[PDB]
Every structure is written in C-alpha cells, then in structure tokens.
Ligand binder design. Structure first.
Ligand code: HEM
Ligand code: HEM
Ligand SMILES: COc1cc(N)nc(CCc2cc(CCN(C)C)cc(F)c2F)c1
Ligand SMILES: COc1cc(N)nc(CCc2cc(CCN(C)C)cc(F)c2F)c1
Ligand SMILES: C[C@H](O)[C@H](O)[C@H]1CNc2nc(N)[nH]c(=O)c2N1
Ligand SMILES: C[C@H](O)[C@H](O)[C@H]1CNc2nc(N)[nH]c(=O)c2N1
Ligand SMILES: [Zn+2]
Lengths: 411, 410
C-alpha cells in the first residue's frame, strides 16, 4: 500500500511506504482525528518481539541482515531476556537507537541534523552525584563556547519501575518563577510549580528575575537531590535590538542551550527514563513563546508601549508588531554573540529538504504539521503548504508523567 | 467515549460527546493521521432512507417534537416519496435548518459563531443559466448590503441522476483574472490562471488588467456553461492604503469585499446540492497574508519590504515578517475606513473560542480542524493556538467536488 502527500505551493508529490513500519497508536480513528491533541513495566512476554524488531532494523542498517552476527545477537538477547527478564544494548546499538529516536521525532523541525548526534553512555552511573557530573560534562560539550553541538546523555534503563533514573527538571537550564502574594509573577511563569518543589527541597532561592534553577536529580529510585550548575557553564545572551536602543533597558537575557530532560527514550522495548538531549534554538522558541505567550514573560505589552503603538483595538495588530520586533532582537543578540541559533525561515526550508531526502532513501518522513509549522508567520514558510503524514516509528522519544506525581518518598 | 479537550493557556477542559454522532470518515486510522491532508483521496433508494431518517430525526429533535405526530407522519411521507420517486424534496423549514447546520458543522471554519444568522435563498425553481445569473446577482446585492455584509446562501436544484447538474464553475463568485506573460511572470492573480483562460477559451473579452473581475460561468441542468458579467455596481471594492506610509497607495492595490464560495457541495438528508454559493465576510489575513503575500499569488512582499528599506539580504532580519504585518494592518485599516465588514484574526479566534464553549455547553461538542482554524500569521498569540480540538464529520455538511471541466461532457 502506497500513500501520497502533495506540496500545494510547488505541486511536488511524494510517495510514503515507510508508514507500513508504523507500530503504536496515533490516537486517531476513522471517525475522529486527534491530530491536535498534545498527549495520549514490560514482561518478557511482549519484550521478545520488541527486541527482535529493533535488532532486525539495526542489522539491516549495517547491511548484515540474516548474518551470523545478527543471529547470534538475537540468540544471545533472547537468552538474556528469559533468564533476566530484560537485556543490555551494545554501545553500537545504543548510538543507533538514540539517533533513530531523533530521526523519528515527527514533531521536530530540526531533524536534518539527526545523524550528527553525540551520544554519551552514562549507563554505569549509580548516584545523583554521578548524574550531576555527567550532566555538567554534557552542558560543557554541547555549549562549546557558543558553537553548539547536539548531544544526548543516556542514564540506566528502567528495571522494575521502582528504581528509575529521573531528571526532575523539564529542561537542564531554565529560569525560576515566583508567584507573589499580590498575584503577579517574578521570573518565568511557566516554571512556578517546579520552582516551589526546588524551594521545598531546600533550594535557597535568590528571588531574582533570571535565576537558573538547580538540577533535581533522582538515581536508582532514591529521593532526588539538589545540585547547582556551575555558573561558568551556563552560557547566556543579553537581549538587545539593532535599532531600538531602549530594548536593552528591559533587562532581558536568555540561556544559550535548549536541553530537554523530561522525556523517555524507547529502544527495542527498553525504557531510558533519564536521557537529557540538547541542540540549538530556533529563534521563535525564545521570542514568540518564552516572552510573548500570555502565560510567560509578557513583555509583549511593554515592547508595544515603548514602540508607542495603538493598544486600544486589536485590529491595529500591535501584538503582531511587537512580536516581530522581539524576534528580531533575539536573533540579533544571539548572532552578535556568536551563539548558534536558526531563524524559522532557514529551519523550515532545511526541513523540507530533509523531508524530501527522507522520502527518497527511506520511503517516508513522519511529520506532525501542528508542531512543524512555526508559531509566527506560518504561511510564509515552505512547510505551511506541505502535506505531512504522521505515524509512530520506533525507536522513539515519549512523554512520561511528572516524577513528583508518581514517586514514593523514602524519607 | 467521553473525550476531553484541554486548552493549554487556560487549563479549561471540555468533554466531547458530540463526536459519537459522527458519521463519515476522517481519513485517519490508528496507524496514520492525515490531519494535514487537504482532500479525501448517485444515492440508491436503500442508501437514501437512513440518511433522510437521521436528518428528520435531528430536525424534529431540534424543534422539541421528537417522536410526535408530525414527526412520524413526515417520516412516513418521506418514506413513501422515496419508495416512489427514488428521491424526495425538503420542506422549506428543513432546507433552512440543513443549511444553517452544514455551516455549524464546517470544522475548518473559524467564523461559525454566526452560524444561526444565515439568510437562505431557495432557488430550487431555477431552470436556466440566465435564471442562475439573476439569483446570483440578487444574492450578491443582498450579501453586500452597501458594506454592511450579511451571510447568505443560495441553493439551486439538487442532483437527480448526475446528468442534470447545476454548477457554478467559478470557485468564488468574485475573483480577479490572471494572465500568464509571454516571457516569465504573471499579470493579475496566478491562482486563476487556468480559469481566466477557460473563460476566453469560451468567449471572454479580457480587459487584460490586473484586477479584472472574472465573469460568471454558470451551468444549469447539465448544459454547456454560459458567461455572464456581474454588474460592476454590484461589486464592492476597497482601495488598500496604509494608515502611515503614503507610498502604500502608490502600489495601487484593492480587493473585493465579498468572499463567496461557489464550488462546494451541500449534503442534507442524503440529498446533494451541487450549486450552493455561500458568502460571509473576510478575515483580514485571507487577503493580505494569503492573497497578496503567497509566492504563487501577488507576492508583492519584496516590493513592500523594499519600500520600507529593510535589510533583505539575510532571512534572520525577519523582513518578510515585518512587511507581512504592515500589509495586514493596511488591509484592515482600509476596509474599516470604508465601512466594509471585516474581522481581524485576533477577534475571529477569540469569537471562535467563545463559540466552542457555547457548543460544548449547549450541544456537547464542536468539530474543529486546528490546521485550518489557526491563522496563517501570528498563530501563537491567538487563543486557538493552545486549544486542543477534535475533528470529525457531522452532517449536514459542505463537501468538495471535482472541477466540472473534467466532468462535464461538453
Ligand atoms: C539541533 C537543533 C534542533 C532544533 C533547531 C530543533 C527544533 C525543534 C522545535 C522548534 C521543536 C518544537 C517543540 C516546541 O515548540 O516546544 C522540536 C521538538 C522536538 N525535538 Fe527538535 N530541535 C533540535 C534538536 C533536537 C535533538 C538533538 C533532539 C533529540 C536527540 C530533538 C528531538 C525533539 C523532540 C523529541 C521533539 C518533541 C518535543 C515535544 O514533543 O514536546 N531535537 N524541535
Ligand atoms: C461570516 C464570516 C465568515 C468568516 C470570517 C469565515 C472564516 C473562514 C476562514 C478564514 C476559513 C479558512 C478557509 C481558507 O483559508 O481557505 C473558512 C472556511 C470555511 N468556511 Fe467560513 N467564514 C465565514 C462565513 C461562512 C459561511 C456563511 C459559511 C457557509 C454558509 C462558511 C463555511 C465555511 C466552509 C465550508 C469552510 C471550509 C472551506 C474549505 O474547506 O476550503 N463560512 N471560513
Ligand atoms: C533538543 O534540542 C532542542 C532544540 C530546540 N530548538 N527545540 C527543542 C524542543 C523543546 C523545547 C521547546 C521549547 C518551547 C517552550 N514552550 C514552553 C513554549 C523551549 C525549549 F527550550 C525547548 F528545548 C529541543
Ligand atoms: C463563505 O464565507 C467565507 C468567508 C471567509 N472569510 N472565508 C471563506 C473561505 C473562502 C476563502 C478563503 C480564502 C483564504 C485565503 N486564500 C487565498 C488561501 C480566501 C478567499 F478569497 C476565500 F473566498 C468563506
Ligand atoms: C498542507 C496544508 O494542509 C495546507 O497548506 C493547508 C494548511 N492550512 C490551511 N489553512 C487555511 N486556513 N487555508 C488553507 O488553504 C490551508 N492550507
Ligand atoms: C493545543 C495544541 O495542540 C498545543 O497548543 C500545541 C500546538 N502546537 C504547538 N507547536 C509547537 N511548536 N509548540 C507547542 O507547544 C505547540 N502546542
Ligand atoms: Zn488524525
């Protein structure tokens, strides 16, 4: 069975056959589309075929399908599963799985880079202090003094679900948010709940406006522990505007390194619940979302007020105007400081090239249009006109519940 | 079974039960989501009666006479008519209800808060293209209303056996001509390049300007289509100027006030109305973001950025974005100065969030296609960006249909 997607700006038509390797559910049915819905331990029983399918992919990629090495690995894994109820990945398999999890992330517009991932094997880690060391080395490597480098650090896989490794932060670097008694918020409104957990865990909060949060790190199912990232490792960029001299006076800055730390990496049925990964920013993830969301820094009003816009009626598009200016400043600031960043025009253009190349050599490229189209100026980017098929391939990155909702406290 | 939709800006969570009355197919499976695919790539007496019963059932429910004397009698009456004639005819009240609810059920339409205010023009007695023309002129005049735009639909005879179809060949009743240049570029509107040529291919006398209003190409009862020129005094146009830059007028832009879709099919109780032009009023981004700044449309993006003297060498200057905003400020300012109805994308999306809440409250759901509801600019500063939506097909409905120049036996 062969499916087709059409680009409505260029009439280019591609043919998807990779969807035949799709596995778990999309959430949709013949009677409902859940395409705009954000969200949805293993027995040897269902683990055997999950491992086999992964190894079949792996040995196909290295042109060794059905080789003696393939069959011995199959036999050795299945023996390990039935005698221990799980199995260990080789280094080679682990690297392959992490890269392919990214290659399969249908919501990620940056996947053109998927094969250039630095994989740090932290599966020998045993304590939160060890996790801290591993994460410090990741941040230093990835940052690279502003010449950012994609990377992932993989902590031990889940066993019985009672000994999980977890990074409680949603991203490795993020600013605190403080709800004031009068109802206003100091800092990042998105991080108010997590900031409270940290303060309750004993974090002495400076209660400034751009306080980097501590790492809250859980090893082997023990209670999590607080660590402060050394400030010399946290690269930051003061935000200024190339024409508006008053923009610096807003006093804004943003960190350089986007590092997702709350997701679950699934490879051959194995679940890696702590796997921070990092790349580099698209400008709009700071300037459209991290300041101008009604639920974030809401400098949207202030920028408009200082541009002296008509804020009486929305049809003056004063919100749209200030939104553009803030995104110009973010890109200008990062480039001036030689900190890697990509604007949404370059990133979407690169993704279309990636997507076409993937249809050629792979038979498809799963993609979530709802997330691929940028949060501003959508229809002047080339992905807006691009039909996209969405399906789940494994290995994959998955959401997992917040650990504070599931953790059993030791005391 | 009782699905939940969350708004991630407000944490409001609505429960959808209306989807259980869904019917047609989405295109998706549990293995593959086609939510970003544009398109879905006569009735026999047995297929027809359940469809009619379903519709009559929801009609008599809406007037709180479900299972009443009138209900069962009407149910029986249509049963007899179908067994006899192999089709049936709608009562005027049912026709009006069906059309309003096809609008209410249009999951790609952000403007649905107004759905119950539709003016329905019953044109089922029409027999000829001249008659169609008359009905369409009256529609345009009524809908335009001197700039105080009013939603309207005109419904021509339903399909019978597929041979005697009524079709408006134009995709919209009012559209600007587009001619390809003997060398490279395009004059007018490139989306209409084929149509603008099909008209001359039939006998049009193209004034060969940029903004030449296309003639109507009306097909009645399956015969060859006929050209008609809409009296220009019926075509309200707004000159586009900017509330700042006076060079903006120099661009010499204008757009028509009346968006009027005319190539879709309306399905009520199993019956198919192949010619059912409907109109409302524009959202500002439909003209400026899409009609002006699309690459394959007017593409004056470069001109506007050039006249703003913006750095156009690196994309990271966001010069396209900057120009795009100013163009959409001008469109809104121009319509508003001329007292021609228009809504900005902030107002329309806010209105739609309110409409959603109303529908979940008094109806149990609201089918909605996020890929189409989110505006093509400034998406994440509008309330619909963070609103999860469930998409499903209810009937009565508006459906796509092939272009008649492939279908018609000339
Ligand atoms: C290297 C430059 C990268 C860029 C420019 C980029 C860009 C983006 C953007 C804009 C999103 C949308 C998320 C949102 O709006 O909240 C996203 C999502 C995502 N990216 Fe990438 N990304 C990059 C690197 C990576 C890497 C290194 C990985 C994994 C190894 C990755 C995996 C993902 C995943 C799993 C998502 C899903 C997010 C979710 O579901 O919330 N990305 N990316
Ligand atoms: C009164 C003001 C109205 C507004 C502001 C409005 C707004 C919109 C917009 C922005 C779209 C997106 C379509 C596109 O981008 O091409 C749309 C789609 C649609 N609207 Fe509305 N609309 C209005 C009135 C109506 C009426 C009166 C009807 C029917 C009686 C209707 C039915 C539809 C349908 C069927 C679609 C889907 C179009 C398609 O599938 O291509 N609308 N609407
Ligand atoms: C792994 O590397 C990545 C690089 C880039 N650019 N984006 C992502 C997506 C994940 C991600 C999303 C957001 C959006 C913030 N919402 C609250 C509005 C901010 C981030 F800081 C971040 F990290 C990952
Ligand atoms: C029936 O009433 C309606 C009112 C409004 N505002 N929109 C529609 C959808 C039909 C429609 C949509 C668009 C979108 C911009 N494209 C250039 C991509 C432009 C139109 F010119 C038009 F006609 C119908
Ligand atoms: C490929 C994609 O589905 C296609 O370009 C859609 C996207 N969303 C849209 N949204 C609106 N309002 N109008 C459109 O024509 C489209 N086109
Ligand atoms: C409700 C909706 O699915 C939700 O707000 C999504 C929509 N698209 C998005 N797209 C991006 N890039 N990032 C997001 O957080 C979201 N949020
Ligand atoms: Zn779907």
């Amino acid at each position: 069975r062969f499916l087709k997607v059409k680009n409505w700006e260029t009439d280019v038509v591609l043919t998807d056959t990779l969807h035949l390797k799709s596995t778990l559910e999309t959430g949709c049915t013949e009677h409902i589309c859940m395409g705009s819905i954000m969200l949805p331990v293993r027995t040897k029983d269902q683990l055997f075929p999950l491992a086999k399918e992964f190894l079949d992919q792996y040995y196909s990629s290295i042109k060794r399908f059905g080789s003696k090495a393939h069959m011995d690995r199959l036999e050795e894994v299945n023996k390990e599963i039935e005698s221990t109820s799980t199995y260990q990945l080789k280094d080679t398999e682990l690297i392959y799985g992490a890269k392919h999890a990214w290659r399969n992330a249908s919501r990620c517009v940056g996947r053109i880079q998927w094969s250039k991932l630095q994989v740090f094997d932290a599966r020998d880690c045993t304590t939160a202090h060890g996790m801290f060391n591993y994460i410090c080395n990741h941040v230093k490597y990835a940052t690279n003094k502003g010449n950012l480098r994609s990377a992932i650090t993989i902590f031990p896989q889940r066993t019985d679900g009672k000994h999980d490794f977890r990074v409680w932060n949603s991203q490795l670097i993020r600013y605190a948010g403080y709800k004031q008694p009068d109802g206003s918020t100091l800092g990042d409104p998105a991080n108010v709940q997590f900031t409270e957990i940290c303060i309750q865990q004993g974090w002495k909060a400076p209660r400034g406006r751009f306080d980097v949060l501590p790492l809250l790190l859980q090893a082997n199912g023990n209670d999590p522990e607080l660590f402060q990232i050394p400030p010399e490792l946290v690269l930051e960029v003061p935000i200024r505007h190339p024409k508006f001299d008053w923009f610096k006076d807003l006093g804004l800055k943003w960190y350089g390194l986007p590092a997702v730390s709350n997701m679950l990496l699934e490879i051959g049925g194995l679940e890696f619940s702590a796997c921070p990964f990092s790349g580099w920013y698209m400008g709009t993830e700071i300037g459209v979302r991290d300041y101008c969301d009604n639920s974030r820094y809401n400098i949207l009003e202030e920028v408009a007020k200082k541009m002296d816009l008509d804020m009486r009626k929305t049809s003056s598009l004063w919100k749209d105007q200030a939104l553009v200016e803030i995104n110009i400043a973010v890109l200008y600031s990062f480039q001036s400081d030689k900190v890697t960043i990509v604007d949404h025009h370059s990133a979407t253009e690169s993704f279309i090239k990636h997507m076409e190349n993937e249809y050629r050599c792979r038979g498809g490229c799963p993609a979530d249009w709802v997330w691929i189209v940028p949060p501003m100026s959508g229809s002047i980017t080339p992905v807006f006109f691009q039909e996209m098929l969405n399906y789940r391939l494994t290995p994959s990155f998955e959401y997992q519940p917040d650990p504070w909702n599931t953790h059993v406290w030791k005391g």
